[PDB]
Amino acid sequence: PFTIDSARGIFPNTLAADVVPATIARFSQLNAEDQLALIWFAYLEMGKTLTIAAPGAASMQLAENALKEIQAMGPLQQTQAMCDLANRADTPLCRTYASWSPNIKLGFWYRLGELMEQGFVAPIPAGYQLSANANAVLATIQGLESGQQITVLRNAVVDMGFTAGKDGKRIAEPVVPPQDTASRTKVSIEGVTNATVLNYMDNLNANDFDTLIELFTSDGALQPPFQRPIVGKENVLRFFREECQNLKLIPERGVTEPAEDGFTQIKVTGKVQTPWFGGNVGMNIAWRFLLNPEGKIFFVAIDLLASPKELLNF
Numbered sequence: 001p002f003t004i005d006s007a008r009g010i011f012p013n014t015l016a017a018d019v020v021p022a023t024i025a026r027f028s029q030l031n032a033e034d035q036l037a038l039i040w041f042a043y044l045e046m047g048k049t050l051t052i053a054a055p056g057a058a059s060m061q062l063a064e065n066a067l068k069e070i071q072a073m074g075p076l077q078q079t080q081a082m083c084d085l086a087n088r089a090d091t092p093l094c095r096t097y098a099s100w101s102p103n104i105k106l107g108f109w110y111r112l113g114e115l116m117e118q119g120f121v122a123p124i125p126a127g128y129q130l131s132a133n134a135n136a137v138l139a140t141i142q143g144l145e146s147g148q149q150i151t152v153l154r155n156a157v158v159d160m161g162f163t164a165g166k167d168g169k170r171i172a173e174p175v176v177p178p179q180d181t182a183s184r185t186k187v188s189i190e191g192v193t194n195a196t197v198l199n200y201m202d203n204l205n206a207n208d209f210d211t212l213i214e215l216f217t218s219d220g221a222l223q224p225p226f227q228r229p230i231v232g233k234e235n236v237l238r239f240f241r242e243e244c245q246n247l248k249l250i251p252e253r254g255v256t257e258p259a260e261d262g263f264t265q266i267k268v269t270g271k272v273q274t275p276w277f278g279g280n281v282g283m284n285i286a287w288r289f290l291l292n293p294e295g296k297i298f299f300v301a302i303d304l305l306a307s308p309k310e311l312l313n314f
């Protein structure tokens with residue numbers, strides 16, 4: 001209950017899927033062309049059984065200029081531009097890309113994948129063979145659960161590009177209006193009646209970010225999977241609005257324990273769906289809350305779990 005960074009250690013039994021950042025670190029070592037080929041290969045195979053939802057109209061508008069620029073290049077330049085993004089080179093295209101929210105980056109690559117499939121953007125060279133390190137990285141990806149596979153792909157996409165500056169322009173999709181109160185569903189969690197946890201889940205499912213933020217302490221933090229804590233209400237609300245629209249949280253069961261100084265620690269396990277895949281991918285998730293004596297959220301961590309065997313009382 002003293003520091004955010006120490007609260008990171010609550011429920012230390014929780015086995016997170018650290019194969020995801022492990023695999024991203026291996027991927028990040030590869031030659032840029034192998035990075036692009038590997039993801040092409042993974043994307044094609046995954047597409048046999050899983051369809052990515054179309055990017056939103058606003059997103060496509062925001063990425064349109066950069067996409068047109070690439071589409072106007074000769075093939076060799078197209079390949080160079082894509083390598084620049086993978087290498088995190090400092091170029092105007094790489095700076096534009098870095099200014100974008102994850103969803104806008106994902107929609108940019110969704111479009112390039114379609115154009116590559118159609119032959120209008122320089123494809124991976126015919127009969128391309130991956131490097132020794134890259135073939136093993138793809139094998140690991142293809143052995144993971146779908147929820148882990150899609151998190152590896154997202155993390156590879158978000159990592160590309162070049163950030164120059166701390167307070168650079170941030171471009172994101174418009175904020176959706178919250179769900180009308182009448183049509184809202186309420187979660188049920190075995191073992192857990194805590195109103196702060198239930199209101200957390202219900203407000204996020206409703207895209208009601210202004211209500212959700214009011215659950216947190218001023219200095220409180222949210223830790224997304226495999227990322228550092230996002231600290232304080234302005235940064236946490238920014239993150240909700242830019243990155244947390246249209247999720248479906250399906251918590252199942254939890255446990256409630258005392259912590260030092262009248263705090264309470266609560267662990268919930270269940271599933272989450274991203275709007276990119278709807279009901280076809282359910283990620284196995286734990287939430288770890290540290291609530292102050294008044295019930296506000298001092299810390300919440302969201303973990304991608306190593307296997308369904310990490311869900312409480314499988």
Ligand SMILES: CC1=C(/C=C/C(C)=C/C=C/C(C)=C/C=C/C=C(C)/C=C/C=C(C)/C=C/C2=C(C)C(=O)CCC2(C)C)C(C)(C)CCC1=O
Pocket residue numbers: 035036037039040043052106109110112113116150151153154157204223224225243244247249272274276283285302
């Ligand atoms: C790149 C590339 C390509 C294309 C690649 C493409 C098109 C790839 C597309 C990949 C896509 C669309 C991946 C989407 C992943 C979404 C995830 C993991 C969301 C998780 C959300 C969670 C867990 C949120 C949970 C949360 C909960 C529960 C909270 O309680 C609080 C909020 C929080 C957010 C933390 C080509 C194919 C063209 C080849 C070349 C190439 O390189």
Ligand SMILES: [Cl-]
Pocket residue numbers: 243274275276
């Ligand atoms: Cl998402």
